[PDB]
Write a protein that binds this ligand. Structure first.
Ligand SMILES: c1nc(N2CCCC2)c2cc[nH]c2n1
Ligand SMILES: [Mg+2]
Ligand SMILES: [Zn+2]
Length: 313
């Protein structure tokens, strides 16, 4: 009960900032996550023995792929931690519990390929789950790990609270399907502008948690430029491997995924910032004003990519 996690002074301070980088020491990531759960939720939310076993089973079920890996999981959970900490009173006890776990689990057993590649491959998962293929798999994997003996971190909840938290986690993980983000953001835009957005409306909360999940999932674009730039290498390492696998199926991949067309990357980043990232953090900042640093950091990185195109780097 009286066993607090403490981080070194630089991490203790920097971890509260949206643009915090979790660092290259894998062995510190579990402790960073537990630290964030204790401050975000309470030292009582989870049985420490159970939580540690859950975290290590989650780590084991992330693969050694360039980007959709254990580091991404903890990076996305940290962004959620920063949003929750800057929006203290807006979220329930169950929501703070659910969302950090949802974020840690959101890409469980990712193979580094898009839903599109699975469907064109005719992967078994594409037969089992026609839409949000990988996201339905990630949630499936989460429930599987929760059901391991000694791994049920929610055991102290009532039947009804247990069903509420697994329903929060399911929707949160489904929302990380970027295909669903466009419609979700549009509806949130309409609702915020016409003034109908109502955080006591469960369907409205769901939408807002969805947008937070997109924002945390894309938070690579909200880091300082050196982190953003080096993470984009890992992202494109996966895209190019998928492009190679598309070519093996006798399909010319979109230029984004074609390693012959690396020149077109900087312009592809502009499109992504303008079509996805900027609108995402804009709508998020409208609904949750204290998340503005994510929009500001994102705009700064767009400017850095414009400088790459103008050959100034
Ligand atoms: C281009 N496209 C991207 N998305 C496409 C699918 C999901 C991530 C990203 C994400 C981070 N940086 C990116 N650059
Ligand atoms: Mg995903
Ligand atoms: Zn992800």
């Amino acid at each position: 009960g009286l066993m607090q996690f403490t981080l070194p002074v630089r991490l203790c301070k920097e971890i509260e900032l949206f643009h915090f980088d979790i660092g290259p020491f894998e062995n510190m990531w579990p402790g960073i996550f537990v630290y964030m759960v204790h401050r975000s939720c309470g030292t009582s939310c989870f049985e420490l023995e159970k939580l540690c076993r859950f975290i290590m089973s989650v780590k084991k079920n992330y693969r050694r792929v360039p980007y959709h890996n254990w580091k991404h999981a903890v990076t996305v959970a940290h962004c959620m931690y920063a949003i929750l900490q800057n929006n203290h009173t807006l979220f329930t006890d169950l929501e703070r519990k659910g969302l950090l776990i949802a974020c840690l689990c959101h890409d469980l057993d990712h193979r580094g390929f898009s839903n599109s590649y699975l469907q064109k491959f005719d992967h078994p998962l594409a037969a089992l789950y026609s839409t949000s293929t990988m996201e339905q798999h990630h949630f499936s994997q989460t429930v599987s790990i929760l059901q391991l003996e000694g791994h049920n971190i929610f055991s102290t909840l009532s039947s009804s609270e247990y069903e509420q938290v697994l329903e929060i986690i399911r929707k949160a993980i489904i929302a990380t399907d970027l295909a669903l983000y466009f419609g979700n953001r549009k509806q949130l835009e309409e609702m915020y502008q016409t003034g109908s957005l109502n955080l006591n409306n469960q369907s409205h909360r769901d939408r807002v948690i969805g947008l937070m999940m997109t924002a945390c999932d894309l938070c690579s674009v909200t880091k300082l430029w050196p982190v953003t730039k080096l993470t984009a290498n890992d992202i494109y390492a996966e895209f190019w491997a998928e492009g190679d696998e598309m070519k093996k199926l006798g399909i010319q991949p979109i230029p984004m995924m074609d390693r012959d067309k690396k020149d077109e990357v900087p312009q592809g980043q502009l499109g992504f910032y303008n079509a996805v990232a900027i609108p995402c953090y804009t709508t998020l900042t409208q609904i949750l004003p204290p998340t503005e640093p994510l929009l500001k950091a994102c705009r700064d990185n767009l400017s850095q990519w414009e400088k790459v195109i103008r050959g100034e780097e």
